Each structure stands twice: as C-alpha cells, then as structure tokens.
Amino acid sequence: TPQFSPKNISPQDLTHNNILTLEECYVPPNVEHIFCRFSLRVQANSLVPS
Amino acid sequence: QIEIKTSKGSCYLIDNTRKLAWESKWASDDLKVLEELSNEIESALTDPNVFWSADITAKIEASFCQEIYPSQILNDKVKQGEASKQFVKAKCADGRYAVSFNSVKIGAALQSIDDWWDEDASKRLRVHEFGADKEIGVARRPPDSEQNFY
C-alpha cells in the first residue's frame, strides 16, 4: 500500500511475469569496431538577437 | 404470398393470391388451408373458454419503386403549411414511423361477406344494419324495407 502495508493478492501471482516487447541493438559477432558519426555546424547567432 | 401463424401452433401458407378469387374453384391444398383455418375460427367464435390469436403476413413481389396505398387520416381543418393528404403511421422501436392500415380498415375488409341482400347479388357489402354501399352511396337494405337488421 502507499504507507507500506502488504495487500493480500495470490502468493503465486508475485512470482508471475510481465510480457515486455522491446527493441534491442547488439554488435554483430566478430565485428571489432563500431562507429558513431555526427556533423557540427557553428554560426555567430549570439552577437545580435534574431 | 400470405403466411398465417396461429397461437394453437399451426402455420398456413397461400403461395399466390392472384390464382384465387371469391367465386373461382381453388386447388385442393388451398381448400385444405381454408377448411382447417375456418374450423379454428369457428371454434374461437363458438367456445368462450379458448384463447385464439393469429399473426397474418402478406409478402408481395414489388415492382421497381412501386407506389404503396396505406390508410389516409381524416382531416377537415388542414393548415396552409401541412400536407392535404397524410397517411396513418405506427412508431417503431426506434424513432421511425411505418406507414400502416387502421384496425377498422382491416375489420371492414374481413367482414365484406354480405351478398344475401339480393337473390343474385354479385357484390359483397361490408356487414351493416342498413347494407350501406360506399361506391353507389345508397342503402341495399333500406330503412323502409324488411331486409334491414331492425
């Protein structure tokens, strides 16, 4: 309960699971290096208000 | 096609009413239907200690956008905005009105049996105390005659 008291639902329902449908990203086997690339542009926009 | 279901539990069917008339000779099955249902109606007319109801349904093969001819309401004080010709309606389970016949209209049709008013009467009048003919507008059993009910 919100103030720490056990509410009585089945003893077997506590070991029960939830089905999770996730997306997972792993490196393929025997791929030594992974790469992350982005491009950065810098403009002089802090001199004058737009 | 006329289907008749009875409270007794019978189920009568006339296949085509175009093949029947009042004076014409019928088929055997149609005479059997007439005989059986006449016996049930006669039993209902003569014995006070029996219940007798019937659900009667006519199924007509419609022509393309054919005109229907239901009961017309009696109105002698019609307004300028309203329809001069209106029909007798019955409200359904939802807020829709089925176009219908009056009970007295059906009653008038069922009791069109009186052709005893003449020795060789072809026309069947609606049973009336003075044998009133709606088409001609005369009494076939006039009040001055001995043929009227009184």
Binding site: - | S7, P48, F51, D76
Partner: protein, 462 residues
C-alpha cells in the same frame, strides 16, 4: 403545457366553446420514453431536492438541530426518532437524489458491458460508471458499502460544494448513505407481509401487452395516459368473466402499471352511417368529434385474493385464465405480444421475491405509473406543483357523485347517478428508481385500488 381540441360548430356545444372559436385547451402531460442515448452525481443535481448548490442547500446546520430540539416534545431521544420519521424520509430523499445518477451509470454499464453514454466521458465524470463502481456484484458492492463512505469525501467537492460539511448530522447522513448501499443492491430483503392475507394471495403478471388507438383524453380536462378507472374496469371485467367461467370467487384487489412504449396517433375517427335523429330520422353520417389517441405497450401486475381452494382452482386452468383476458382497452384494441416474441405473457406467482426477481429485468426506458399523496386546493397549486416536478402528470382519478342514486329511464343498472370526473396527480417513476428503492417500497407504494364510498369513487394507494 396544453394541447388543442377543435369543434365544428362551437355554439351548439356551449357559450365557453363559442367564445374560444371551438378551440378548447386540455392539459398535455404524456409519458416520454426514448430508446436512444444516455447523453456525474447530473441526475441528483437535476432532481433538485438533491445537490449541486441549494434549494435546499445548505443545512448549514442549526436548521436540522433546531427542528430536532422543537420535536423534543416527548423526550430528546423519542423526538430525534420523530424528527427522523420525516427527516429520515428527507435524509432518504437526499440519498435517493444522489443515487439517481449512480442508478443511470450502473444501468448503462449493464446494457453496454461496453459503455455509459460515453465510456471515457463517464470515467471523466466525478460520479459516473467507474471500473471501481464496477464490481464488487450487484450485492457485494452494497455489502462492501465502502464506495458510499468514499463518495462522502467527493461530497467535499460536489453534492454540496464547500459549506455545511461537519454541520447539523453530516455523519448521520453519511451513515444513512452507507445503509442505503446495502439497500441499493441485491440478493437481500425477502419476506413477511400482512398483504394480501396469510390463506395465501396470488400475483398475475401480464407482460408485453400492445394496445392500438386507446383514448389519451382520460377526462375532457387532461391528455396523456389512458384513465386508471379504464385499467380498473378492464381488470374488473376480467375478474367477473374468470369467476363466472371457473365458478370461483377470487378478488382482483390492486394492480401496478408499467408503460414500456407510448406514441400519440394523429387524425380524427370517421363515424359510420346510421339513422341520425331529426323530425324525420335519416340514414347519414354523424358529426366528426375530435379526440386524442395513443398506441402503447405495457405490463400489468394484478394482486389476487381469495381461498386457496379458489386460487389453486385458478392456477390449475392456465388456458381458461388466458381465454377470458379482455381485447378492449379505453376504446382501443388490446393484443398479447407477437407469437415469435417467445414471451410467456400470463404468469402466476405465489411469493413476492420471485416476482421482484422477474420484474427488475424490465426495459430501463419504461415508466412505472405511481400513486402520489400531494394535496391540491385549486388549479394554481396543481400548476405550481406541475411546474415544480417534471415527472408529475394531471390524470383522471374517478367520480364525485352530483345527484342521489335513483330509478331513471334509459339507465343500464337499477339506480342511475350523474357524476363529475375528479383531477388527481400520478408520477412517471423510472424502472431504476423503483429497482434501487427496494422490494418493500415497490409492494407498498406502487399498487392502485378503487376507494368506492357513498358519495365518491376514486383511485388511490393501498
């Protein structure tokens, strides 16, 4: 609310009719039964005895405490109980108001098992069909009550917004609401009744009765439902035929009347040709009299008294019971439900629990025609009382005798008397309201009888 009756030549009728050009006004209060949509605590707040704010919030009280202390003629405790007798009916009315919308929600949630009016909008409405009000079961929800106690916290915000919270009694009202929970549900109540006798009684339930073109004009003052004296007369004709058929002597003492469907039928009725009177009586059509006609579908519950010899003589003959059911009602044609409906339309019951278990399965859009005990001294009080409550209707109650009964030529019976039609008030209660109010309330405060006295014959309660 008034509707019109037009006359052809009004000067032949009266001077009052001649002055108005033949257009006579009649009180138009018909029952309104809709098949369609459900669209909050709304039904309470609308019933406005009830809630939202005022008439008559707030007690804040002082008002209730002062009333109890005044009623303390005969001992503080005995007074509080005497206050309660009126104040508990008043406190019960507060719960009944509050329950009006709880009734609607539940109702929907049955029909549905899907929906309210709007499932999400209901869930949003502070006092609607919540999956928490969903259950537990009715029965277990009432046995739980809990919901009723919680709603008291919600009634810190609506069912009297702010004022009058700890004030004379709020605890007593909460206790009454918690008690009503138990009453609001199910598989409870049940037994013990001086009415009718018991040696036993019977209950004849006539279900799904269809009537075509019954006279909506109860008396020439009021329009709406057919006359209760018409329902009495039909039941009395049914009794007479049954008692003469079986050779028994049972009495059809009281009835309760539930309307499923109602619709007004347009047009006048064409009279047939007959010998219309003059110096020389001629075969012609009579004058066309304007009237009001209705198609209605209803249920009757008739309360049968007599000896068990006669009752079990009645119960043994079901076909002879069905056979003598009349086919006339208020001028209209009266039929049993259709042969493909699969509805047993003429059922007998020995006990009240079995009948109430059958009766709470009725359509929820239909209306119980219920007797009231309101007093009226003139028309203006009746009109104010009609402008007060939206579910009240002026109707025909019966006959106040003018002359003394004596032998008169052309009389149907030995003695003839001229009488005046008396205007009373009925209530169009919802099926849900009668369902929640309990079995005792239904079997005490829904049944009509004819009080036949020396100088008046009126339909009333009991």
């Amino acid at each position: 609310r008034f509707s019109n009756v037009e006359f052809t030549r009004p000067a032949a009728v009266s001077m009052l009719a001649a002055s108005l050009g033949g257009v006579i006004n009649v009180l138009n209060y018909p029952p309104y039964i809709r098949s369609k949509y459900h669209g909050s605590n709304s039904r309470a707040f609308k019933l406005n005895n009830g809630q939202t704010v005022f008439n008559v919030e707030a007690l804040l009280k002082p008002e209730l405490i002062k009333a109890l202390e005044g009623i303390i003629f005969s001992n503080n405790a005995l007074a509080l109980k005497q206050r309660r007798q009126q104040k508990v009916k008043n406190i019960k009315e507060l719960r009944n108001t509050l329950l009006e919308w709880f009734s609607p929600v539940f109702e929907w949630r049955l029909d549905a098992i899907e929906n309210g009016y709007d499932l999400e909008q209901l869930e949003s409405a502070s006092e609607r069909l919540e999956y928490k009000i969903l259950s537990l079961p009715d029965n277990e929800l009432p046995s739980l009550t809990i919901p009723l106690f919680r709603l008291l916290n919600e009634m810190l915000g609506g069912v009297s917004m702010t004022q009058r919270y700890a004030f004379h009694p709020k605890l007593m009202s909460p206790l009454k609401a918690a008690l009503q929970w138990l009453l609001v549900n199910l598989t409870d109540q049940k037994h013990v009744l001086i009415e009718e006798d018991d040696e036993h009684y019977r209950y004849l339930h006539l279900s799904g009765i269809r009537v075509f073109d019954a006279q909506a004009l109860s008396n020439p003052y009021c329009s709406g439902i057919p006359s209760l004296t018409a329902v009495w007369g039909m039941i009395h004709s049914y009794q007479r035929k049954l008692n003469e058929a079986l050779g028994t002597n049972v009495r059809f003492t009281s009835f309760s009347w539930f309307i499923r469907n109602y619709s007004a039928v347009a047009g006048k009725k064409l009279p047939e040709l007959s010998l219309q009177g003059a110096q020389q009586s001629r075969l012609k059509r009579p004058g066309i009299i304007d009237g009001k006609y209705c198609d209605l579908v209803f249920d009757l519950i008739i309360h049968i008294d007599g000896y068990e010899d006669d009752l079990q003589a009645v119960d043994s003959k079901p076909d002879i019971l069905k056979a003598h059911f009349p086919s006339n009602f208020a001028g209209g044609v009266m039929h049993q439900p259709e042969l493909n409906s699969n509805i047993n339309w003429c059922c007998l019951y020995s006990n009240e629990n079995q009948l109430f278990e059958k009766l709470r399965r009725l359509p929820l859009s239909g209306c119980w025609v219920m007797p009231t005990e309101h007093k009226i001294q003139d028309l203006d009080e009746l009109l104010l009382l009609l402008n007060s409550d939206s579910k009240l209707s002026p109707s025909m109650m019966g006959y106040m005798l003018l002359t003394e009964p004596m032998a008169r030529v052309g009389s149907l019976e030995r003695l003839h008397c001229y009488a005046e039609p008396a205007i009373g008030v009925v209530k169009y209660e919802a099926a849900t309201s009668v369902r929640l109010k309990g079995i005792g309330n239904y079997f005490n405060s829904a049944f009509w009888m004819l009080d036949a006295q020396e100088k008046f014959m009126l339909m009333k309660k009991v």
